[model samples]
Target: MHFETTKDGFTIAIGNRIILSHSPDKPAFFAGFGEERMDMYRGNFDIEDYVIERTALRHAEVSGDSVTLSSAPGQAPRLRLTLDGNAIRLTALDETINRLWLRVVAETDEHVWGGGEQMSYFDMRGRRFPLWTSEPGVGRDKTTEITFKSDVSGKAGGDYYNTNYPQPTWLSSRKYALHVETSAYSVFDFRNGDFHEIEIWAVPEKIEFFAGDSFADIVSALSLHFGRQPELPDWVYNGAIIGLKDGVNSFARLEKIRAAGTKVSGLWCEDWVGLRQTSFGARLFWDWQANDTRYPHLRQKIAELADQGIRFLGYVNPYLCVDGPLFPVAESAGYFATDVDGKTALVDFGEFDCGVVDFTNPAAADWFAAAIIGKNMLDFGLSGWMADFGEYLPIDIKLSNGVDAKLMHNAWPTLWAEVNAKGVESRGKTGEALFFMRAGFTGVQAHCPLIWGGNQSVDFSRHDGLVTVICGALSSGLMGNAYHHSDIGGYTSLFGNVRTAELIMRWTEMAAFTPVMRTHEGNRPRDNLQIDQDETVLAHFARMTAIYVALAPYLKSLSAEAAKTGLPVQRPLFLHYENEPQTYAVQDCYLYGADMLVAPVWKAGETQRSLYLPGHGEWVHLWSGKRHAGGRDITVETPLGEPAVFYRADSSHHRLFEQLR
Candidate 1:
């Protein structure tokens, strides 16, 4: 590749491979790569366009491989570029939306990872990255069909099924990563095999291109661009995030659970109206009449549950179900999101129909926070809640701030998170507040105390299984959603499989070692077995939870470090063993903080599995205390009673590791 300064700007030529030129006076940072070498698709799927919306370049200067340009001659350059040693760095000094593009020759074994919590393959080599918030389908099997169904323009009746959590900034195995520093909608299409393309909707005052060969350098650059991770509340590590939907019935179950041997730190209850059964199959959000005769006693019952040592959580979102009375309340008050026609806009989710809350209007947001969540849930007893489904709002809908969905699609979650965060802070419960959310993007982390991987099925498979959780957590850690959780044994029981005893047992085993060990009931036809209903399954879960509690002293330190560094409580192996080629392919395994390695059973009826131990120390098996050298593959037996795990033999987690045995 060669670089030169032209009279107007500069150009890059990749000998017969690809050639690119850029200037304040050119057409969209001109590039001429062979059609066979790469493909670049802007937002419209199936259709490809690479024309610059507009470019204004008024100043240009050169210094060998480094070129600086500004919109005005005597001004601080609007952007700076340097083809430093085998890698390129681009920085935007101004806040105006600017067009920046790249042309890197991807290699044969070049694999890409980290587009933020995807359920598909860890390697992003064969796909396009749609940097938008979406709900991946219910079970593992649907991700493929749902993801690429091409009816994505919302005309094919298949988009509701199409969802992938938009975590932008992919890390490439070729030792580089391209990150868009803005929260606005963007897309990364790199499926062309030979090269890649990244486009951002609104370029912030900055754009950082990390073209390094080492994973650590790429991750460090990404972390520094985002602020440090915030410290989670103190009670986060206490363990057992049990999901109970019944307000009063939960109290009885807690009594039985305590009697039968399980300590609960908190509970995650779904939408408003009431708990699961109160809605009777229409278990999604209902009328928020809890403030009146419609389920008035529910709040008191929730308060009773909190009266126990357990924290009670209630759910809330910016959506007011149209089928319920709450919809009319928000709509008549003009709190509902408006359509382009200036009328109330609603989302038809099938099971429930709802209108989006106009959070852009501070009066709307403040009213809901004070009247709904503050008055109904928190004022009574709820400690925290699940902030669910911020994704899937229609693109044609108009937000109160006069923002279009083209730019608001990816940023919607931050507004959802902010509303919940404001409610917590307004009530003076910021430190004690626990708002668990999904559908997170760039700015969502600062407000998210704990993030749960949305929905997964009962059984293990590539899309929505244990492996996906590991990948999501590791990926989220990189993106700074430090503390993460998921539903054990999966949240949906569809796809011809019911929740089995072994699945729950194995899921709990894995969950026990995450930042918080939690599981919930499924939306499938069959119900999951309660935690204490079976002593055998309960015992293993309790054992892991106990170990999690025991490890809190170590865990707290790690959480604090994550808060300061933007690292995750759980992380992928590559972060620790960047030099080890094998670790990059080991998303099935992850580090439980800075120590312990956890490899959950991603398949059922599997007695043994292959695990690659990275790093330079000996990996001590948690069960047998048997040690094996790192940087090599090792086979370990995974009984129904165990989820394969290991820790650095001499690390501080030794005592805690033994109990998992």
Candidate 2:
């Protein structure tokens, strides 16, 4: 890489490819600041209303690998850019400007991906994505009646671009990637065809550009740049993690499921701590501990489940209910964020109030890791847990680090993930004890082992349904989260929307191909169809779980490669077929570990779907074992449990896939 001063401006190049170019006539830098208004309901954020005043750079001076820009050469430079290897460090010279905008040269035909786990689009070419970690919201399409009702009722209806994981990084089809180093709220605007404009709430510390010969090479560079996730735990590939929440009766139900010949890797009991009933649905008790009354001899129960070849998984978050047993403990130790009155600040997560764990304080973070996660969860004989909810930090609280809460808002998720990572590492259980999260920022990849798709509505809607999980995995996978999965039947159920037997069966077929197969009972479990709702659904689920377990060897290979090269287990079709122009916009289907393609039926009452097979070769359908030529459109019969899945004819795992039949 080289930085050169041109006749009229400056340019940074990787070999012969110019990644950035700047000129006074066509300025690419802006700086300003304005008041921001942020409101919150549960984890849903309303930051849509804000004003920003900015101006373009008018003066510049270049020397070697460093450049200084200002309104005039006589005054102090507003920003200074210094090149270090492939990264450009931007130092703020003027304290008056709190915001910065930089435009990178783009082509009209260039395709972009990675606004962390985008649910609606794979080729993010002409949309403005606000990079904020929050609840993805229910029914994300505004045109739908469900979304309108959700908005009018609780302001929880989201838009197409809303996501729980939003990273300030993007990979371009030109075989280069750009990453901004900041946790401040940002907007990566790709609305302009010839330029990509970045709007950050703060002057970024650095910006890095990577160029490569292939999309895989670009993804590897970007993953290494951020930090790659470790390989998923081996137990994840054992089978499906069945979700049940009937207290001690949950174990009875598990026995029934096992007797029905279902393959079970673990049982996820989020309400093991307790349960709280709300208008929204059945919520978990925010306090993190074993509810002895719900399940007597809790430790022994976990051990007993493990002895039966099943792992016990629970849930935890970075909040404590104000009225729970742990709230006073955290408050007494000064581990909770404080409000203007210097009292412990409280956030209302729906109908319950909770205190946010102050991760900014080193002592507080250490205490939570040791006292809560280490002693309460992992040491309680649990093998894994869901480390949920890091996107609820209020922007008006005071932190121990003395930084403004607004700047720390976007970073809270990473901090939360790091706390969980510390707990796992401190106990020397990195590979043995697994944890997954939904919220993330720039560096969560290095800390979180798994990234679960946040709550999707319990339907086959266009924006927030089963197909969206495919988009989520492909988008986040490009940004270094190799392992991505979702609730088999979708999680959110509201306003008369409930899961059906067909939906569960279709979701089960898709989950069989993901990194891990996990089921989630919607918030109102009684209102939805369970895997054991009827003999037919139960038989379908058992068949899918058996299929998932049968492919463990192939899945293990994919996991190892992802850990080694930062390539995702679930890949976009374009990753392997760069010349296939049709593959770029195909988000409804994905390449599972470069060998098999899965197009799950995400519509109701649909038995057949159309999909494209990229590259020139033969694809063997998984259901019928019929061979078909690639690089063309084909329709497949998607039976109840047989999704539109195809494996490469020459794949080394052909025998394994054949056995799935």
Candidate 3:
């Protein structure tokens, strides 16, 4: 790192690539404070207005490895920039400015990625993204009619920036990462070609920049900083965790799938606690207990399934339904958050109401872990669960810890993940049990074992379809999330959108190459097509599950490496092919670990498609023995059950790759 000061302002350069330049005419730093009124409905949010006071940088003083940059007017915030090993940190010296904005020098041709599981776009250039953890709304494009109908009917219309996980970190084509170390709301604006402007809602404790020789180097550093996920449980790699929510009928469906010769690992029944019919379709009763009426002899069923080498996974969130049996228990224990009037606060989730378990209170986390997850789920012999819904914290509610709700809102997901981790660890199931979550923030990778792409529309749409999950994995993977998967056919089926067998098959084939292959019966199971709905779909699912199981040895190695080195199971092409310009913006395809490349067919009725093979060596197709050289685009014929996947011809796992063929 080096620094220079001129009569104008100052410049800090890290490595030969990342350069931060500032001048009075072109101030790199901007600061002031802002006030906002946040209103949340369900998991979506609305901020009517932001009254901000804005100021620009005026002076700078360079001292050794540190430089002090001051904003205009004496009352404005002053920032101290210091060199910290291979990275640089910019800290605010005072609290006069809650809002901080800075522009980093960027090239016109540079591409930026990694905004914590971005679904819509892979290359975030010419776009402005707001970093806030919330519900990635259904049909996430405003130009579409599905989004329009959803918007007017339920304040759930979302733009491209909305995501369940929005971290204050981004990776550039220059192989550097710019990260902000705060849970407050922020925005990364890449709309300008000259520079990237970062706007923070609060005075950040530190703004760090990391430059690396390769994309992997940057990711390794980011993972080390954010914390890597624990290795996936061995059971996860066995086969697909079939999602079936038909009470005892779910086990019968499991038998039917097994009869079809499908490899079964576990059954995830989200409605194990029972169900409440809503317009949203088959919402879990959210009591965090086994509804004996729904499944007679629940413990026996779980034990019987476990005896057959199949695990049972259920669902649990931090919120307790107000009318459910667990609500009174939590209420009596004072585990719920309170409103301004000092009464218990309740959030309306569509047609149902739920009390937010106050995780800020240590006692609340302990009780939920002990009484709810440990006793109800684990004690009943369940192996894992979907640790869902951490993004529903409302800003109007008051937490017992006395931290402002606005500051705690984005940090809720990590707390929720911590509670789940404790629940599993408390029972000594840390390595044996598993859980997946959709909502997250900066530090969630450390606690959440797996990340499931949230609520994709069950269609071939660009923004909310099968392809988006790939982008989600690549984006979050760069942030050290080792394992990622999605509902095979997608979860949201509304506004005339329904799943087809082709879509499910396509998703299944794509999932086979990922760390874990899971299937989800969409929210409206009756409206959407299921894998068992057709003979061909069932056959396709069985074939894919077999393929997934066959690759367990390879998958286990990837999981082990992820746990040891913080590298991801799924990777971007640029992670390996640094010199390939074409690979930088390719969101539709990815490298499965280091040896295989998978290009999923995201369009309906498309039998053949084109994809790029990054230059390194020769590549061999998975289903066929045919080989192709790298460094160019190639068109291939994709059959019904076979996806476009290839392995390195000289890969160490070539023997296993050939066995799949």
For each candidate, the alpha-carbon lDDT, in order, equals 0.65, 0.88, 0.87
- lDDT by residue (1-661, candidate 3, tens digit) is 6676766777777778646788878888887777777788888998654656788877666788887777654544478877776556767786677888889999999999998989988789999999888888878889998888888988787888899999989999877888888888888999999999998887776767777787888888899998887777888877989999888889878898999999989988888889999998888888888898898788888889888989999999898888887799889989899999989998999898889999999999999888887998888888888999899888888999999888899999999999998988899988788889999998898788899998999998888888999999999999889899999899998877898888999999998888777888878988888887789999999999999999999999999889877889989998889888889899999999899999999999998979998985899988888999999899988989878999999999999999998
List the pairs of residues colliding in candidate 2: none
| lDDT sort, best first | 2, 3, 1
The residue pairs found clashing in candidate 1 are: 115-167, 175-212, 175-213
Better of 2 and 3 by lDDT: 2
Between candidates 2 and 3, the one scoring higher on TM-score is: 2
In candidate 1, what are the lDDT values of residues 565-601, reduced to their tens digit? 6677787787777777787766777788768888888
Runs of candidate 3 with Cα error greater than 4 angstroms are: 63-66, 72-77, 82-96
**Can you write out model 2's per-residue Cα lDDT over 173-247, one digit (the tens) per residue?**
888888888888899899998899999888888988888889999898888877887777777777889898789
Clashing pairs in 3: none
Better of 1 and 2 by lDDT: 2
lDDT of 3: 0.87
| Highest lDDT scorer | 2
